[PDB]
């Protein structure tokens, strides 16, 4: 449970190269003598795998991903392998298949086990009377919500250690489609000092088990013997592969065994095979696949802009109005950059609340707009919503739900002289506070007393636009600060201020896409020789073809040319003759992908030769190829 | 600037807070002077302002639960609170608004731990 | 009010490491992003204003950059007499809503 093997030694990750192995059957369906073609997990071939032991220097066993498909094979000698681990998170959260052997039976179960840290099995006492009988099970420790149980038939298996080399060959599949988990089984005779078998074989199904379940990760579980942490293990090792979805060819003689496989993504020689659907292929040239190269990004190349909302009469301007006669200026039917605004290094005060300035520049918004007032260093801080004083309860009100931005700065260089500036005004008195968003121009007499004021001031009678005092011999907190409030609001109007503009760099003789203000697609830009007209955006081939574009911002006319592709042919020798083939693109250079430049494209994998001989394969435009000594 | 505060650190619930945050060094000429709660385990917030010219003016976190005076002749600026409750078991800082010889100070002083119990 | 939020809790460096504290608040830290120095045994003191000025008696290794709200003070070669507690604010509008904080020490 919480004691741990003390014998476990760190491993570097190496790997082993196989010939053919990972071929099974798919299904049950029989043919003779053909070559069917199916989509499923399949181990390709010359692939790395993992490269474990399970011997006394190294005894390693990690958790390995399930959801892309794992392959097993492991040689055996003396019934090492036992049982595995089939769980999501390998813990007793959620449900995990359980399937080992303790040389009896078959266990089965499909319950929420407490898996310990780290899980074993062995014999004990091997220095007299062994008999290679189980007497240890610590896989887990409780169960609790199980949903399936299998018992297989009684047996006995022997686990005795037979020196010399090794025997016995166990390979299995663990795959999990749509909760259906299968078993393929095989057992042959082998000889192996140290390495996987680099032949090939076939796999069969075993047994069936609906368990309905996801399993994310795996577990392989070893066996100990020595004759409770430094317990050593016997001598034996496995190797875990990654299935990928690939397309296999099976060549099923009269009694069922797979003979032949071909890998359609592996070699240009076993690409033929897939397309002509035979194993027997003739002298000649033949089409497998078709080249794409793919795109590596979008760009939109616009370096400038083209409109823009009046932000420079707003921030730049020379007078402004009062706190109580605040102009509002609706913003609209433009584009708006505010990402300048945060990187201008020129605003003393600039904080928007409920969202960042640079997360609202790549969205789209209907109504912007923009106040702008000049008042005293102690009310720039009154806006926002909550605040009590003169502005915010009787002059300039906001609501809970303001989701706009504060722009203030300093302006004591403009808004102040010598002798004091009694331009400004705000209101000091008032019967009730304001509601949000409004705005209050009275220039009625406050009546502080019961007595009427009768519009002239007296007892009580206080004018309520009182006059601001700005003056340069002040301190750094009363200075005159212009204030500018941005107000964003959404309604059911379409959005029209808009503009996300993402530009990197000038990209020749690439495949990227563009964006542009009228026509997108996926295209080259290179040079061009025409000479367009200045309204004109874009050209058009005769079959509707778009491959010119005009640069709004840059007069540079660059020509939108398609991508490379072509099909892809290969030079195939007999299958009693050689194995050397050759790449052959069409339609494409030798840069944009043994090298020869044809007519039809780049040929890579043959020798130029200045003799000229019977043409025996065609290649094209005059080109031939053979075969010499 | 030496700042230093002074007052009873023992106000029950439904009483009043009075304390005095001593300035010693520099006039009130400039600057202003704040109050940040301090939670226990280094978490501060904010509580209020005052200007030095007589402008009185209210944060939204003490709306109507804040009085803070002025002294321009002694040279300090008292602090009282409306209402205290359970919640006030904190610690005052003051702190100056100073920006002179084209540098930004900011003094704190040592501070008086509060305790509402009963 | 500007929701600040810090991801380090502690920094453990030592002499010549740099010291990288970041302030990922939910709301604008705006531009006049400062940080306080809180010495032990004494009172928390000002060490940045303005993203780009220190503070009197302040070496010129006591730096800040950034871009937008992701803003990190920039502390190169730091000595054994710069163990503090850094906090993330702004200085642009009251009130001040303050963070969580991130504890400095050495390594010995």
């Known amino acids: 449970q919480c004691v741990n093997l003390t014998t476990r030694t760190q491993l570097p990750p190496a790997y082993t190269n196989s010939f053919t192995r990972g071929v099974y059957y798919p299904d049950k369906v029989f043919r003779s003598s053909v070559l069917h073609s199916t989509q499923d997990l399949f181990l390709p071939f010359f692939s790395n795998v993992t490269w474990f032991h399970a011997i006394h220097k190294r005894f390693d066993n990690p958790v390995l991903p399930f959801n892309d498909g794992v392959y097993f094979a492991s040689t055996e000698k003396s019934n090492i392998i036992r049982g595995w681990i089939f769980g999501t998170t390998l813990d007793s959260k959620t449900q995990s298949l359980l399937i080992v052997n303790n040389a009896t039976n078959v266990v089965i179960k499909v319950c929420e086990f407490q898996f310990c840290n780290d899980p074993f099995l062995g014999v004990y006492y091997h220095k007299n009377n062994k008999s290679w009988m189980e007497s240890e099970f610590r896989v887990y420790s409780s169960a609790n919500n199980c949903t399936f149980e299998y018992v297989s038939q009684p047996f006995l298996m022997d686990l005795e250690g037979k020196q010399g080399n090794f025997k016995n060959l166990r390979e299995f599949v663990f795959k999990n489609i749509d909760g259906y988990f299968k078993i393929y089984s095989k057992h042959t005779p082998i000889n192996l000092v140290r390495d996987l078998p680099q032949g090939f074989s076939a796999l069969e199904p075993l047994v069936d088990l609906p368990i309905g379940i996801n399993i994310t990760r795996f577990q392989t579980l070893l066996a100990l013997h020595r004759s409770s942490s430094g317990w050593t293990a016997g001598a034996a090792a496995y190797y875990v592969g990654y299935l990928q979805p690939r397309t296999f060819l099976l060549k099923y003689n009269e009694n069922g065994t797979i003979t032949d496989a071909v890998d359609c993504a592996l070699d240009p020689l076993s690409e033929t095979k897939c397309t002509l659907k035979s194993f027997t292929v003739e002298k000649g040239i033949y089409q497998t696949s078709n080249f794409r190269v793919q795109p590596t990004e979008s760009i939109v190349r616009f370096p400038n802009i083209t409109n823009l909302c009046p932000f420079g009469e707003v921030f730049n301007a020379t007078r402004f109005a009062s706190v109580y006669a605040w102009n509002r200026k609706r913003i609209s039917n433009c584009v708006a950059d505010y990402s300048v605004l945060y990187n201008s290094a020129s605003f003393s005060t600039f904080k928007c609340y409920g969202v960042s300035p640079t997360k609202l520049n790549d969205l789209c918004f209907t109504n912007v707009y923009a106040d702008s007032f000049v008042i005293r260093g102690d009310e720039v801080r009154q806006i926002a919503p909550g605040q009590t004083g003169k502005i915010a309860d009787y002059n300039y009100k906001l609501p809970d739900d303001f989701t706009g931005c504060v722009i203030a700065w300093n302006s004591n260089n403009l808004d102040s002289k010598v002798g004091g500036n009694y331009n400004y005004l705000y209101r000091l008195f008032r019967k009730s506070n304001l509601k949000p968003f409004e705005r209050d121009i009275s220039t009625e007499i406050y009546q502080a007393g019961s007595t009427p004021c009768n519009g002239v001031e007296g007892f009580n009678c206080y004018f309520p636009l009182q006059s601001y005092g700005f003056q340069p011999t002040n301190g750094v907190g009363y200075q005159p600060y212009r204030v500018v409030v941005l107000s964003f609001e959404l309604l059911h109007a379409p959005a029209t201020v808009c503009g996300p503009k993402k530009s990197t760099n000038l990209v020749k003789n690439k495949c990227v896409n563009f964006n542009f203000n009228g026509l997108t697609g996926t295209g080259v830009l290179t040079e061009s020789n025409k000479k367009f007209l200045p309204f004109q955006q874009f050209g058009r081939d005769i079959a509707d073809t778009t491959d010119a574009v005009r640069d709004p911002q840059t007069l540079e006319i660059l020509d939108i040319t398609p991508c490379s592709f072509g099909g892809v042919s290969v030079i195939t020798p007999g299958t009693n003759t050689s194995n050397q083939v050759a790449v052959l693109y069409q339609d494409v250079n030798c840069t944009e992908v043994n090298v020869f430049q044809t007519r039809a494209g780049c040929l890579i994998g043959a020798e130029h030769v200045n003799n000229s001989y019977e043409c025996d394969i065609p290649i094209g435009a005059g080109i031939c190829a053979s075969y010499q000594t | 600037v030496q700042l230093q505060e002074s007052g009873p650190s023992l106000v029950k619930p439904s009483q009043t807070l009075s304390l005095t945050c001593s300035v010693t060094?520099?006039?009130?000429?400039?600057?202003?002077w704040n109050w940040i709660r301090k939670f226990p385990g280094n978490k501060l917030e904010y509580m209020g302002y005052?200007?030095?010219?007589?402008?009185?003016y209210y944060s939204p976190s003490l709306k109507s639960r804040i009085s803070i005076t002025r002294d321009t002749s002694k040279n300090q600026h008292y602090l009282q609170l409306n209402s205290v409750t359970s919640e006030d078991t904190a610690t005052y800082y003051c702190?100056?608004?100073?920006?002179?010889?084209?540098?930004?100070?900011?003094?704190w002083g040592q501070g008086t731990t509060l305790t509402v119990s009963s | 009010d500007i929701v600040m939020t810090q991801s380090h809790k502690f920094m453990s460096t030592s002499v010549g490491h740099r010291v990288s504290i970041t302030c990922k608040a939910s709301?604008?830290?705006?531009?006049?992003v400062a940080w306080y120095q809180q010495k032990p045994g004494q009172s928390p003191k000002l060490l940045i204003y303005?993203?780009?000025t220190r503070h009197t008696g302040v070496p010129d290794r006591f730096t800040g950059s950034g871009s937008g709200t992701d803003f990190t003070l920039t502390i190169s070669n730091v000595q054994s007499e710069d163990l503090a507690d850094y906090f993330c604010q702004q200085y642009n509008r009251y009130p001040y809503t303050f963070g969580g904080g991130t504890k400095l020490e050495i390594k010995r």
């Open positions: 303005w993203a780009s």
């Open positions: 005052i200007s030095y010219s007589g402008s009185t």
């Open positions: 709301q604008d830290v705006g531009n006049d």
């Open positions: 060094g520099d006039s009130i000429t400039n600057g202003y």
């Open positions: 702190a100056s608004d100073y920006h002179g010889s084209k540098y930004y100070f900011d003094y």
